[PDB]
Design a protein around this ligand. Structure first.
Ligand SMILES: C[C@H]1O[C@@H](n2cnc3c(N)ncnc32)[C@H](O)[C@@H]1O
Ligand code: SF4
Lengths: 772, 527
């Protein structure tokens, strides 16, 4: 097919084990809202996420790659545990679904043909895969205290050939230890054999270490009390007791738990070490492949690496990262509010650390041996629904927003710092214009440098393009801005008020290739000091602004606010020259104006709302005032969502999309009178939400891209009267949730069409279509 | 250097103090002097604090040596750390169906402030904490609890307050998210489902001993009360501001007093505890009617709420009161007059009603006209002493403030029991108190679920007495005594087969050892 997903930008979730890495073929898969997401962090051309395995219905909590197998388990808040198998070398397809537990699944750890599921009702369910077919059968379920211990983290190990341990942490300061054997059709001899004690608070995460020395290994358990405890598991003939007939005076905290697995594997698990001083909780901890180094990812925006002291046999801080000022979802002051789950994998001589940034963006750290560590590129994406996708004036870059209080400027990576164009264009997050304090809704481009946005408030703010991002884009994407270096400097996040100041006086150059960035910007830079200054806010609306559009003349901006009556369902128009408003209103609607469009010719304004009626207003050339020209009464039965303007070449013709599961194309006519009667109509199976039409004509037919409410995107070719289905996008190349915005890129690079998709599945997609 | 010697000075101070305290020996010169004798070798402005040295103790020694500096019961022993958070700014519900907003609420979403929630001015410490957290509950809660931890408190019972406008007028998904986020920032669980969040927070360390949700009388219907009891709410705060219907009418209040009284009855019969707001110096009131309404408030057996909040009317720029104060239509009281009025009002507060607060802490440089100082209760108590009468408020008779302000210790504890009728129900008020010195050591409210107003499926099935509130401040087997006497009362005095206590989700385990089983959102026990 000629349609390929060029870029995907999804934000990671916030759970404690959202992510896990396939080791034998390093591939990081992490949950993101309703879906999972794949990622290669070591691609030669630096691509981020490329496929979102849909199928769940709620937030994906835990994802675990079944070691030494082509399986990965995922757990959803909708009480579903799914098993996924590699079909492609770099893709997976759901094979098995487990619906049970009547509750959320919290902890989920897997071993070859042996997975463990912790249900928040308080149950631990061990599942063993059937020998004959790739399918898991419920092996054994058991509970602890039945009303007091609910699980929080799980991890199990293969102590012997057919014997298995299970360490459960939960709402208890005692780590429970169960052991069992595998009978090739089920498990038996299973019960809680030990309760390791020494913690004082909840046990957040725990993880066994690889048995590189048979008979003994190490198990770490990190608590909420900022402590880590290392326990020494010693199998028989290596238990190494203390001769008790001569009194050695052992302490009670050094009690050794001995138990029989079946009757004969005497295990003598003993506490080994106390790791001190994490300054906050231990959100995620994980061993190393070979070396005896322990990675602790904490909730104090910090991540560090311990190792045994070569001198005293104790543990010290080998490495520490995250000291660059930030606070996860905030950045003004750090201290409790940073790092979620962590992955730790080594390429040739490169210890990559990968970490959730409490903002939907991954963070990389590549270090050579143990000391020199530098940030490599990661990925990003919103954590909440994405609403508006505003293309730059000529498709140069993409402005995105979200219900999460942020807007982000993306662009593809083309020209290296050296100057020569790269091989394949990779899209990266290049600016974060608004770390706002309102539910961002509607953003639209004014020009190459100016852009106007409105979140959840009665006002809407215009921003200029700052020097930093503009120069850096000209370095990387090679954008030509007439060299007009009168643009204001890079801004900051205001420590007072909310209007984005210039940031000239405070920032705590970079555009130059000799600066610290040879690649798209880094997360610290991006969220702290790569903002955009604000020009002006435009009062006038009463309620929260809902829909916004800009006229091609770059003079008048049309805006509406959410309402429930006629006196608030009016539309305002603002003059860009003085940032003030128009004197009258254009009141016909009674409900909230959903989509509002300015025609290719700046004389016709299209409005549509929940009244299921559309309207078209003329414009006075002389006075820049509008008046009613056309209106409709029952163009649809249910609500209408979005209306779009066809290119002027195809004529004065527009289109509406409505929850009748239908779409109607209206072209102007003059036979009995002047109006745009319904020239065409299509009906789908699911409610249609967004529709986008390419500005450019192709072979006497316009390209209309329609988006459904379950995510399935259709591409259509429309001649006069008849609509030709170009294609529909398969389940692999569509978001899993309602589509909120579709916008055809005005640019056409290397003979391809770019389509910007923004869905309610916390994801913005860029699609490439081949049409020469 | 400038500051390094300060860090190493704190370090040696910590190590030496730990070494001294291991065998049980105190310091000599209040370490700051010893700190300086070493760190101010050049006297380069190095000024330590008690918090500074506390943030130096190692974990194993910190958790065991920290409370050996503080001894006030409610401060670190009772440990009900009032941790206030705020919701996103929004417009209060009545504005839609009346035409304009309350005529005295400063700030909001469409005032001169673009950032502060309704009825807030964006200058209180809570507002700066909310904005520096961007109104996100997770950051708010984590930051506040961490600041409390840093300042050396050994907090273990966080009590949440949800200030700001009417929290109950938000889309249900948003409120569910807010409450789950609060409980998650407390316990550490990272889920999203309210049921699981509650179940996890119940076992949690740093118990959520309750949560207060200030609201409006209209938005406290049966379904709303069910919602807030799902959340974990334990005390309600209701705006009243006046018993005279004309004042409520002229203030664009939007809810009749009869509605307030009905809401009081149904909420107190839902097991809650209500604290009401009572504004003096409202327009068209005058001192005579001010005293009249405050004297009726405790005399009408219909309101008689357990808490109170006296908020003298402060006019601030931008409100609906500035366009009425500027014209001179309304003139405020006098400083001496208002102090006297507060004195006389406080003289009438019955022993059970607790005065949670007095005049708002809105900054002086912003108030156009109203209360001058910020220490109104100080002058009120001085004038009370001058007049001879004395205060019976719970907060003015509880042990904790006495041990640090009055410096008086309790030695004549005795059992006292009030028995009044409020909101159509029979409410007992048990306490262990000091009759000679009027010092309240422990208290416990109790209510006979009235047939007229109760609605919970847990209560209408069989006769029930609700332990609406149990509080012990300053051996120490009091909760046990009060609970046993309440059991005796509910078995004989009330004739109730099942007695159930409403409880913050954090403390639900404490009643477990008392033999209570969890029924719905209450900790119940049959008899
Ligand atoms: C938060 C509590 O304070 C009341 N309130 C409203 N406006 C003011 C003001 N200007 N000063 C003091 N209290 C006020 C609210 O009405 C509620 O009763
Ligand atoms: S009077 Fe009540 S409803 Fe009106 S703004 Fe104040 S708190 Fe909100």
């Amino acid at each position: 097919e000629c349609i390929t997903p060029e870029a995907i930008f999804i934000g990671a979730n916030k759970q404690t084990q959202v992510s896990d890495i396939h080791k034998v073929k390093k591939i990081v898969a992490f949950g993101a809202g309703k879906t999972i997401a794949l990622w290669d962090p070591i691609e030669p051309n630096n691509k981020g996420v490329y496929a979102t395995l849909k199928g769940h219905e709620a937030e994906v909590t835990c994802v675990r790659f079944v070691p030494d197998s082509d399986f990965m388990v995922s757990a959803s808040e909708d009480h579903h545990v799914k098993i996924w198998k590699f079909t492609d070398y770099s893709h997976l397809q759901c094979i098995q679904t487990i619906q049970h537990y009547s509750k959320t699944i919290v902890a989920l750890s897997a071993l070859p043909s042996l997975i463990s599921v912790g249900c928040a009702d308080g149950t631990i369910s061990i599942w063993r895969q059937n020998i004959q077919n790739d399918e898991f059968g419920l092996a054994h379920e058991f509970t602890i205290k039945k009303g007091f211990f609910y699980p929080l983290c799980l991890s199990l190990s293969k102590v012997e050939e057919k014997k298995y341990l299970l360490a459960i942490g939960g709402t208890n300061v005692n780590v429970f230890i169960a052991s069992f054997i595998l009978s090739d059709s089920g498990i038996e001899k299973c019960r809680v054999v030990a309760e390791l004690e020494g913690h004082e608070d909840w046990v957040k995460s725990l993880a066994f270490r690889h048995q590189e020395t048979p008979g003994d290994y190490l198990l770490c358990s990190g608590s909420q009390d900022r402590y880590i405890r290392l326990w020494r598991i010693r199998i028989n003939d290596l238990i190494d007791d203390s001769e008790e007939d001569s009194k050695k005076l052992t302490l009670l905290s050094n009690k050794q738990y001995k138990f029989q697995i079946d009757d004969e594997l005497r295990v003598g698990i003993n506490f080994e070490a106390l790791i001190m001083g994490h300054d906050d909780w231990i959100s995620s901890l994980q061993w190393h492949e070979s070396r005896l180094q322990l990675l602790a990812a904490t909730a104090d925006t910090s991540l560090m690496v311990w190792e045994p002291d070569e001198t005293s046999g104790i543990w010290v801080c080998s490495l520490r990262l995250g000291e660059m000022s930030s606070k996860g979802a905030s950045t003004a002051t750090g201290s409790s509010g940073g790092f979620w789950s962590c992955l730790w994998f080594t390429h040739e001589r490169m210890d990559f650390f990968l970490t959730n940034g409490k903002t939907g963006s991954w963070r990389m750290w590549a270090t050579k041996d143990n000391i020199i560590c530098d940030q490599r590129l990661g990925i990003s994406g919103a954590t909440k629904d994405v609403t508006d996708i505003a293309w730059s004036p000529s498709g140069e870059y993409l402005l995105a927003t979200s219900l999460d209080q942020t807007t982000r400027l993306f662009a593809p990576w083309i020209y290296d710092a050296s100057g020569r164009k790269r091989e394949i264009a990779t899209w990266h997050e290049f600016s974060r214009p608004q770390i706002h304090g309102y539910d961002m809704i509607c953003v639209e481009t004014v020009t190459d440098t100016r852009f106007v946005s409105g979140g959840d408030e009665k006002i809407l703010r215009s921003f200029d393009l700052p020097k930093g991002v503009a120069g850096m884009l000209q370095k990387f994407v090679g954008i030509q801005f007439e060299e007009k270096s009168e643009m204001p400097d890079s801004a900051t996040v205001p420590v007072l008020g909310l209007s984005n100041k210039a940031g000239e006086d405070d920032a705590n150059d970079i555009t130059d290739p000799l600066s610290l960035l040879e690649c798209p910007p880094m997360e610290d830079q991006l969220q702290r000091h790569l903002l955009w200054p604000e020009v002006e806010k435009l009062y006038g609306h009463g309620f929260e602004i809902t829909c916004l559009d800009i006229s091609p003349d770059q003079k008048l901006i049309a805006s509406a606010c959410r309402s429930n009556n006629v006196q608030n369902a009016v539309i305002r128009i603002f003059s860009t020259e003085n940032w003030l408003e128009i004197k009258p209103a254009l009141p016909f609607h009674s409900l909230t104006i959903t989509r509002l469009k300015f025609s290719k010719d700046g004389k016709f304004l299209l409005s549509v709302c929940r009244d299921r009626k559309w309207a078209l207003w003329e414009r006075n050339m002389e006075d820049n005032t509008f008046e009613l020209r056309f209106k409709n009464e029952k163009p649809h039965t249910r609500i209408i969502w979005d209306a779009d303007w066809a290119p002027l070449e195809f004529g004065n013709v527009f289109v509406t999309a409505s929850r009748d599961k239908t779409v109607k194309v209206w072209r102007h006519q003059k036979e009995p009178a002047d109006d745009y009667v319904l020239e065409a109509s299509i009906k789908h199976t699911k409610a249609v939400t967004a529709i986008s039409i390419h500005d450019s004509m192709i072979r006497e037919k316009i390209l209309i891209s329609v988006g459904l409410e379950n995510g399935e995107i259709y591409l259509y070719s429309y001649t006069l009267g008849k609509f030709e289905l170009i294609t529909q996008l398969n389940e692999d190349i569509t978001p899993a949730d309602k589509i909120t915005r579709l916008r055809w890129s005005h640019l056409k690079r290397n003979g391809k069409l770019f389509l910007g998709v923004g869905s309610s599945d916390l994801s913005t997609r860029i699609y490439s279509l081949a049409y020469e | 250097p400038e500051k390094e010697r300060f860090i190493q000075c704190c370090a040696d101070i910590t190590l030496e103090l730990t070494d001294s305290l291991t065998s049980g020996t105190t310091r000599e010169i209040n370490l700051n002097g010893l700190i300086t004798k070493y760190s101010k070798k050049y006297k380069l402005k190095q000024q330590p604090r008690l918090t500074d040295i506390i943030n130096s103790i190692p974990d194993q020694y910190k958790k065991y040596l920290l409370p050996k500096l503080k001894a006030k019961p409610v401060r670190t022993a009772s440990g009900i750390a009032v941790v206030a958070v705020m919701c996103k700014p929004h417009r209060c519900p009545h504005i839609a169906y009346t035409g304009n907003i309350c005529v005295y609420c400063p700030g909001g979403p469409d005032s001169d402030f673009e950032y502060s929630t309704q009825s807030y001015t964006g200058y209180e410490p809570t507002s700066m904490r909310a904005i520096r957290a961007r109104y996100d509950p997770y950051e708010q809660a984590r930051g506040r609890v961490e600041q409390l931890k840093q300042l050396g408190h050994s907090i273990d019972k966080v009590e949440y307050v949800l200030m700001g406008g009417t929290f109950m007028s938000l889309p249900k998904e948003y409120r569910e998210d807010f409450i789950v986020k609060l409980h998650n920032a407390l316990s550490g669980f990272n889920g999203n489902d309210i049921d699981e969040a509650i179940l996890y927070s119940q076992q949690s360390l740093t118990k959520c001993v309750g949560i207060t949700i200030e609201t409006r009388p209209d938005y406290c219907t049966q379904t709303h009360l069910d919602d807030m009891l799902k959340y974990g709410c334990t005390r309600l705060e209701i705006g009243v501001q006046s018993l005279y219907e004309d004042v409520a009418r002229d203030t664009n209040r939007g809810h009749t007093v009869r509605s307030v009284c009905e809401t009081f009855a149904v909420s107190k019969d839902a097991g809650y505890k209500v604290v009401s707001h009572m504004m003096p110096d409202l327009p068209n009131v005058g001192m005579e009617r001010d005293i009249e309404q405050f004297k009726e408030y405790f005399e009408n057996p219909d309101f008689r709420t357990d808490g109170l909040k006296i908020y003298p009317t402060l006019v601030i720029r931008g409100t609906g009161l500035y366009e009425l104060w500027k014209t001179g239509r309304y003139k405020s009281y006098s400083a001496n007059a208002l102090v006297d009025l507060v004195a006389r009002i406080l003289a009438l507060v019955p022993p059970w009603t607790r005065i949670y607060r007095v005049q708002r802490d809105i900054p002086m440089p912003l108030v156009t006209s109203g209360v001058d100082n910020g220490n109104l209760r100080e002058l009120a108590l001085a004038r009370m002493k001058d007049l001879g009468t004395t205060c019976r408020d719970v907060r003015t008779r509880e042990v904790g403030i006495q041990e640090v302000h009055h410096k008086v210790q309790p030695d004549q504890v005795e059992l006292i029991r009030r028995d009044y009728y409020a909101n159509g129900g029979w409410e007992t008020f048990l306490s262990y108190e000091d009759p000679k010195k009027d010092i309240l050591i422990g208290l416990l409210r109790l209510r006979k679920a009235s047939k007229k107003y109760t609605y919970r499926k847990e209560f209408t099935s069989q006769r029930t007495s609700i332990v609406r509130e149990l509080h012990v401040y300053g051996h120490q087997g009091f909760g046990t005594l009060l609970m046993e006497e309440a059991e005796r009362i509910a078995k004989e005095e009330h004739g109730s087969e099942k007695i159930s206590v409403i409880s913050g989700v954090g403390v639900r385990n404490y009643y477990g050892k008392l033999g209570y089983e969890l029924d719905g959102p209450y900790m119940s026990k049959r008899i």
